[PDB]
Amino acid sequence: DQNTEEMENLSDRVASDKAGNSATNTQSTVGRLCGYGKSHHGEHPASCADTATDKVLAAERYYTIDLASWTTSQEAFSHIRIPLPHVLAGEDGGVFGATLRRHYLCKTGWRVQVQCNASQFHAGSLLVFMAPEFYTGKGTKTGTMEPSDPFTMDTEWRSPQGAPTGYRYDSRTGFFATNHQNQWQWTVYPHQILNLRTNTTVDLEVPYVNVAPSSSWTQHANWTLVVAVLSPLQYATGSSPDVQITASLQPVNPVFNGLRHETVIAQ
Amino acid sequence: DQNTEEMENLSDRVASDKAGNSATNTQSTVGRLCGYGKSHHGEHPASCADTATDKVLAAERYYTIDLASWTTSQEAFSHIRIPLPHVLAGEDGGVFGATLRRHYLCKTGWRVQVQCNASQFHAGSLLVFMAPEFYTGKGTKTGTMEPSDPFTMDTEWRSPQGAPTGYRYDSRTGFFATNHQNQWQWTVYPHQILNLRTNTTVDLEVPYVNVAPSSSWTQHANWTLVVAVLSPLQYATGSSPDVQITASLQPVNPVFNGLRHETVIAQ
Amino acid sequence: TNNKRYPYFSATNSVPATSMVDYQVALSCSCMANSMLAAVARNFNQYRGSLNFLFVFTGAAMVKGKFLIAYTPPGAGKPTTRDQAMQSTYAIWDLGLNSSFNFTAPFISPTHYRQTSYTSPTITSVDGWVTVWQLTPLTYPSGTPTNSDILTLVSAGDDFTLRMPISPTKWVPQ
Amino acid sequence: SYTSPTITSVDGWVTVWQLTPLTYPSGTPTNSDILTLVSAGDDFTLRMPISPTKWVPQ
Amino acid sequence: TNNKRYPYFSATNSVPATSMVDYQVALSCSCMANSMLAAVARNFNQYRGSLNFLFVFT
């Protein structure tokens, strides 16, 4: 189901989204999940007496960057996580990031687009889904208890472990931990599939939900994005192995308030 | 003339201006010159197809800093210049400066407030006036022709020279140059006096006028602010010599457009 | 130095420092406790709304000064220079006829509410520092004092709300 | 004014002196400077363009 | 004395003299020239109307 079409990628499968002074195109879409059912109204935080910095064009655009390389080698449910805000955080994050750390609080929603184009003699299936409270880390900390690098952008892929007991942490054992995940239910999150067969692209938009109408970006990361693979990349001797996966994102109608003087640290 | 009043500084002489999340007060004002007769309408540059970054609260506030020290020593028409934009330019210039050099062009108008409070047993008179095309420099360049540091903020005061012939520049002599100024007419510029006697403060607001509706802040500086003194500071043996002069400014309704990726240099 | 706190922010002739003072806004501070608001705010678990700091000058009438004042939210660190401070909610106070200034540090809070303060450590919720420094020195002719003291007085605005009665922390003063 | 001498037409002297001295208590200055600034009223009229007297300042 | 004209009429404690100053009104003077009005008044052959002198105490 969707319009008439293909070897080549056609019509009601060609979509475009313009935002700011950055404009996108895909000639082989299957939708765009507006995850949950509502978007984000630049509804001012009721929390603050701060009549904040609103409707700035300059930050409300599409920042694009590379996540990783997909290749024949990888095993199912191996995964790659992208926390928002903390990856659009500075340098690579335009005027958004700047105004982002000059301010105490933000409240935004994200509109994401992950791209991975192949060829009709390629098999595989990439699962893309946005989940708020989730896990990052990239580590078991040094020498003193608690837990390595959530802000880092998983440089390489992590190993589906024959068992949650969600990478607990201080030399121990017996039993599980509150960072569990059942990568086996990991399709209750607003998601969308990327089937080299069907899909060259996948668009997801998600509203604002933390514990407070606005949160602080120096200790939390309300949503982590996950580009982890559910049916690997077979390739027949001829053919383009190098399956370059790219992601391009857009904060939707952020509302910043609580302004001050350029946050200082990232190792 | 102005309301009833004084040894102490009173009523229709107490003014306040709130802008953004920065709010000012003076209990000994004499006005506020809206220089020329019109202010600045966030009139979008007609020059660009760039539906720019407008009405940002966060940059449209009052940045405050110290210019210099006024003291018994100085001679008439000695002067101190403050180019705008290039002094609110970065670090010391909040979110304005950031968004300022992430963008190619700006168009703004300035609302300035210079303060210098003394005591009724003090004599002197400080002339404050905003002039667009004017002169800065801070130098006769090194070894090769043309002309030392307009972006620098005159670190110390310069000497009224018994003659314009507006500090011409390559070893020469005979005759004058297009950077003349008659500090003797230097009261045709929107100005305002600061009379320790009358005045503790001076407020000036000036609209947008360059050669183009928007200009480029890396080669021009459309307005330079000048806090140079017209009747020195006598003090009678007792009394607070240290006459600290402070300036606090506000860009009024800047309109930025033509966005790109953090400008790079200042020595 | 004697730990003889006393009531005045006190100032002169020139340059701070990192100035004049600094008290945070942690409605449990050292400052605000003993104060009504802070004394009342305590027999309650949570607080919301805007706070107000009022500063009355006590110096000679033949004097003259000019102070910068600011609330700087948590995110980065405690300012260490006016310059660094100014980028926060503030007000340049012009010392004149009109003796006192009224300031008021908002409520820049994620949470709709905050904890009235019980400092099993400093946890994330609490927030605030208010600083103040001179933006021009405090000037004065002949025959008048160098030195001058200016008198401190906290209050809870037209926005202040305390809820959850409780009962603190058994003391027995001094 | 073009002062191939002083011919009959031109006219004026403005003077100024204190009618009572300039007084001041203890702790304040003897001496004080007062600042000068000419202008042409609601009555001033200039007519006959010309172009003066080639200079080249200082 | 240095011929360092400067901008102030400057005064004190007592008696002039024949005072304080004296500048004539000959819209070509030494004074008024350099001044706008006087600077503008020059690129013109004739003048009429009333002049105004403003004095600000410092």
Check contact B-D (3+ Cβ pairs < 8 Å): yes
Check contact A-C (3+ Cβ pairs < 8 Å): yes
Q: Based on the number of CB atoms within 10 Å of its own CB, is B217 exposed (0-12), middle (13-18) or buried (19 or more)? A: buried
Measured between CB atoms, does A14 come within 8 Å of chain C? no
- Three-state DSSP class for residue E36: helix
Identify residue C73 by its one-letter amino acid code.
P
| Residue A95 near residue B53 (C-beta atoms within 8 A) | yes
Probe site for chain E from D6, D8, D11, D16 (most E CB atoms < 10 A): D16
C-alpha to C-alpha distance for B77 and E6, rounded to whole angstroms: 9
Q: Does C77 sit within 8 Å of A260, measured CB to CB?
A: no
Q: Which of C14, C136, C140 sits opposite B115 (nearest CB)?
A: C136
Q: Which of E35, E46, E56 sits opposite D47 (nearest CB)?
A: E46
C-alpha to C-alpha distance for B35 and D4, rounded to whole angstroms: 42
Chain B residues within 8 angstroms (CB to CB) of chain A? 21, 50-58, 94-95, 98-99, 102-103, 256, 259
- Three-state DSSP class for residue A13: helix
| Residue B233 near residue B70 (C-beta atoms within 8 A) | yes
Question: What would the two tokens of residue A229 be?
Answer: 């693979």
Identify residue E58 by its one-letter amino acid code.
T
Q: After which residues is chain B broken (C to N over 2.5 A)?
A: none
Here the CATH number for the domain that contains residue A70 is 2.60.120.20
Cα within 13 Å of Cα(A106), Cβ side: 29
Phi, psi of A58, rounded to the nearest 5 degrees = -25, -30
C-alpha to C-alpha distance for B234 and B219, rounded to whole angstroms: 41
- Three-state DSSP class for residue E6: coil
Q: Does E6 sit within 8 Å of B184, measured CB to CB?
A: no
Q: Does B231 sit within 8 Å of D37, measured CB to CB?
A: no
- Rounded to a whole number, what is the distance in Å from the CA of A103 to chain B's nearest CA? 9
C-alpha to C-alpha distance for C125 and C111, rounded to whole angstroms: 8
Question: What would the two tokens of residue C127 be?
Answer: 């927030």
C-alpha to C-alpha distance for A102 and A96, rounded to whole angstroms: 10
Q: After which residues is chain C broken (C to N over 2.5 A)?
A: none
CATH number for the segment(s) C1-174: 2.60.120.20
Identify residue B153 by its one-letter amino acid code.
M
**Torsion sign over Cα C26, C31, C37, C41:** positive
Q: Does C77 sit within 8 Å of A46, measured CB to CB?
A: no
C-alpha to C-alpha distance for C52 and C153, rounded to whole angstroms: 9
Q: State which approach was used to obtain the coordinates.
A: X-ray
| Residue B130 near residue B223 (C-beta atoms within 8 A) | yes
C-alpha to C-alpha distance for E37 and E25, rounded to whole angstroms: 12
- Rounded to a whole number, what is the distance in Å from the CA of B208 to chain C's nearest CA? 25
C-alpha to C-alpha distance for E35 and D38, rounded to whole angstroms: 7
**Secondary structure E strands in chain A:** 15-19, 22-26, 33-34, 63-70, 81-84, 103-106, 109-115, 125-131, 191-194, 201-206, 215-216, 223-231, 243-252, 257-259
C-alpha to C-alpha distance for A162 and C100, rounded to whole angstroms: 69
Choose among A60, C140, A42: nearest CA to B118. Answer: C140
Q: Does A264 sit within 8 Å of C84, measured CB to CB?
A: no
**Torsion sign over Cα B130, B134, B140, B144:** positive
Measured between CB atoms, does B175 come within 8 Å of chain D? yes
| Residue A28 near residue A16 (C-beta atoms within 8 A) | no
Which residues in chain C (141-170) have CB-CB distances under 8 A to chain D? 141-143
Domain boundaries of chain C, sorted by first residue: 1-174
Neighbours of A120 (CB within 10 A): 11
CA dihedral of residues B112, B118, B124, B128 (deg, nearest 10): 0
Neighbours of A220 (CB within 10 A): 19
Q: Does C135 sit within 8 Å of B119, measured CB to CB?
A: no
Provide, as residue numbers in chain B, all residues whose Cβ is less than 8 Å from the Cβ of A55. 54-55
How many angstroms separate the Cα of A209 from the Cα of each of A201, B66, B163, D28, E38? 26, 44, 68, 68, 72
Helical spans, DSSP H, in chain A:
94-100
Question: What would the two tokens of residue E10 be?
Answer: 């400057």
Q: Does A98 sit within 8 Å of B95, measured CB to CB?
A: yes
Question: What would the two tokens of residue A210 be?
Answer: 């933390």
| Residue B86 near residue B249 (C-beta atoms within 8 A) | no
Identify residue A137 by its one-letter amino acid code.
G
Chain C residues within 8 angstroms (CB to CB) of chain A? 50, 72-77, 79, 84, 87-88, 106-112, 124, 159
C-alpha to C-alpha distance for A202 and A196, rounded to whole angstroms: 11
Is omega for the bond preceding A160 within 30 degrees of 0, making it cis? Answer: no
Question: What would the two tokens of residue C106 be?
Answer: 């908002």
DSSP codes, chain B: --SS--SS--GGG-EEEEETTEEEEESS----EESSS--------SS-S---B---GGGSS-EEEEEEEE-TTPPTTBB-EEEESTTTSSSTTHHHHHHHSSEEEE--EEEEEEE----TT---EEEEEEESS----S---SSSSS-S-BTB--SS-BPPPS--STT--SS--SS--TT---TTTTTSSSEEEE-TTT-SEEEEEE---SSSSSEETTT--SEEEEEEEEE-----TTS---EEEEEEEEEES--BEEE-S------
| Residue C92 near residue B24 (C-beta atoms within 8 A) | yes
Identify residue C116 by its one-letter amino acid code.
T
User: Resolution in angstroms, to 1 decimal, for this deposition?
Assistant: 3.5
Identify residue A245 by its one-letter amino acid code.
I
Interface size between D and E, measured as CB pairs under 8 A:
143
Interface size between B and D, measured as CB pairs under 8 A:
30
Phi, psi of A65, rounded to the nearest 5 degrees = -155, 170
Q: After which residues is chain E broken (C to N over 2.5 A)?
A: none
Question: What would the two tokens of residue C159 be?
Answer: 């926005």
- Provide the 8-state DSSP code for E27: T
Chain E residues within 8 angstroms (CB to CB) of chain B? 4, 6-8, 34-36, 39, 56-58
C-alpha to C-alpha distance for B24 and A26, rounded to whole angstroms: 52
Question: What would the two tokens of residue A264 be?
Answer: 């200082």
Instruction: Print the domain residue range for B264.
Output: 1-267
- Rounded to a whole number, what is the distance in Å from the CA of B219 to chain A's nearest CA? 22
Choose among A163, A187, A167: nearest CA to A177. Answer: A167
C-alpha to C-alpha distance for A192 and A30, rounded to whole angstroms: 9
Probe site for chain B from D30, D38, D58 (most B CB atoms < 10 A): D58
How many angstroms separate the Cα of C83 from the Cα of each of B60, B80, B85, C14? 17, 20, 18, 16
C-alpha to C-alpha distance for A147 and A135, rounded to whole angstroms: 11
Helical spans, DSSP H, in A142-196:
none
Q: Closest chain C residue to B70 measured between Cα atoms?
A: C136
Which residues does B239 contact at the CB level (< 8 Å), separation at least 6? B119, B121, B122, C140, C141, C142, D27
Interface size between A and C, measured as CB pairs under 8 A:
63
| Residue A148 near residue A131 (C-beta atoms within 8 A) | no
| Total tally of structural domains belonging to chain A | 1
Provide, as residue numbers in chain B, all residues whose Cβ is less than 8 Å from the Cβ of E57. 197
Q: Which of D35, D37, D57 sits opposite B163 (nearest CB)?
A: D57
- Three-state DSSP class for residue A224: strand
Choose among B198, B181, B204, B194: nearest CA to B230. Answer: B194
Probe site for chain E from D38, D45, D51 (most E CB atoms < 10 A): D38
**Torsion sign over Cα C35, C36, C37, C39:** positive
| Residue A154 near residue A81 (C-beta atoms within 8 A) | yes
